[PDB]
Amino acid sequence: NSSLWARFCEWITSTENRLYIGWFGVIMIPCLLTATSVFIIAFIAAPPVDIDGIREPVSGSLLYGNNIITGAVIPTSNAIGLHFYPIWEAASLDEWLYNGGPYQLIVCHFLLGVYCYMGREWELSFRLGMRPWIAVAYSAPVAAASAVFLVYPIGQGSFSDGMPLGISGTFNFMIVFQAEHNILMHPFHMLGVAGVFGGSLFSAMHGSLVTSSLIRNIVAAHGYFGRLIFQYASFNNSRSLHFFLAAWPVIGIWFTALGLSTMAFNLNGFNFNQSVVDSQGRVLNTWADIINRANLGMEVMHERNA
């Protein structure tokens, strides 16, 4: 009957599967599975990694005395830099582990997987005959992930600067990032915080209004909302309201990702240090100065010289 290629192609693009595969799933599925397996194995059991390249390894495996809240997959060593580090370039497997190669493996496969996941979202949207813009919404978290794992190491010149694949590792990354860069006092991070908080606000309010509407409607909910906070002609159409819901968080996350990426090239946030002075040029402190003191503490504290 039909050639083997014909049947196999029909199977991939078949829409009767429990989980759609598509032509983007051929690259997404193996990459994501590789990343998942390597991440799980490294998290559970992996030798300590010499992150700083000074023969002082950091242990982040679950078998080396870490919890779930403390375990992590330590990023590659500083000595490696931006160099490509597959298994077959390491001198030996122990050497590969000691320099944090699994982090590079996981990051690469994960990024490929997420990009192909966006593609797969689009392709199924096309197959079902709906408008193809869920991928654009998904591009925000993908952009943030790319900024954290790929762009920032490029800007800083090393892969040891990427976010560790852990929880306490995430907190350490954030604290050190604030120390080096005033992330808090950067307009794009402010836009990101506004986006997240507004997303929470809008989700809660929309859910409450819609739930209270369904009784066994839209006009009553709109009247209630208008009487509440003086907005009678705000988002009367359901389509406009749902577009606003989609747009606000996505724009916020786009801008915060761009802020992080720009900081990767050392374009820091606002710096109001000693901005206020009285006569005779004596410095009067402000809240920015206390933030500066905290940043100075964090900066000075992690500068582990040998």
Binding site: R18, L19, I44, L62, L63, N67, I68
Partner: protein
Amino acid sequence: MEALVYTFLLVGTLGIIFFSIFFRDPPRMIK
């Protein structure tokens, strides 16, 4: 011994995810 407990909890969560994905509940009427 704590590593066993952590790993078992993670595996249990993954198993629940698998069950929810595949052994799904058929929709009822009205819903």
